[PDB]
Every structure is written in C-alpha cells, then in structure tokens.
Amino acid sequence: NSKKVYLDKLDLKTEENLLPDSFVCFEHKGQYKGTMDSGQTKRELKSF
Amino acid sequence: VKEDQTKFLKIKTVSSELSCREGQSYWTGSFSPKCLSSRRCHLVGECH
Numbered sequence: 001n002s003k004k005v006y007l008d009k010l011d012l013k014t015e016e017n018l019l020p021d022s023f024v025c026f027e028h029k030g031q032y033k034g035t036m037d038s039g040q041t042k043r044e045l046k047s048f
Numbered sequence: 049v050k051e052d053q054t055k056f057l058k059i060k061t062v063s064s065e066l067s068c069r070e071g072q073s074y075w076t077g078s079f080s081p082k083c084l085s086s087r088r089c090h091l092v093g094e095c096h
C-alpha cells in the first residue's frame with residue numbers, strides 16, 4: 001500500500017523459517033514409482 | 049645645468065619582514081562515516 005521509496009542506505013537482514021517457500025523439492029527422471037517413470041538416456045532432475 | 053634638470057630618483061624602504069619559506073603541505077577537513085550492513089546466515093554467499 002505504498003509507492004516506490006528511494007533510500008540513502010541499504011541496511012537489510014534475512015531471517016530463516018520453515019515455510020514451504022524455503023524448501024527446494026526435486027525428483028529424478030526415470031525414478032522408480034515416480035512421475036516420468038520411463039527409461040531415460042540422460043540423468044536429469046525434475047521439480048516437485 | 050644649474051636651474052635645470054635636477055632629477056631625483058628615490059628609493060623608499062617600506063618595511064622589512066621575515067617571511068616564511070614553506071616546505072611540505074597537505075589538506076584536511078571534517079569527515080563523518082556512513083555504513084551499510086547486510087547480515088547473512090552461514091553457507092550463504094561468502095558466509096564461510
């Protein structure tokens with residue numbers, strides 16, 4: 001609920017948490033009992 | 049020739065002063081610092 005705010009200084013800090021956006025979930029291609037469960041000619045990952 | 053010419057050149061001694069012969073020099077002023085801070089958790093960026 002504001003406009004652009006220019007600053008003279010950039011003092012910023014980050015705090016961690018356990019919300020879903022903090023986790024990177026992946027899967028393998030050709031992985032047994034998973035999505036894309038078929039023979040692959042290359043070892044690549046897939047998003048989850 | 050008498051009653052003619054008679055030109056006068058005068059050397060007035062205004063003042064005698066003991067002037068200074070400067071050697072090295074530098075400049076200075078008033079300074080104030082400004083700091084930008086950024087806090088990151090371990091293994092983030094270069095937080096090793």
Ligand SMILES: *[C@@H]1O[C@H](CO)[C@@H](O)[C@H](O)[C@H]1NC(C)=O
Pocket residue numbers: 091092093
């Ligand atoms: C995760 O952290 C930084 C990114 O902020 C990255 O440079 C680093 O290599 C990563 N650490 C791993 C992959 O272990």
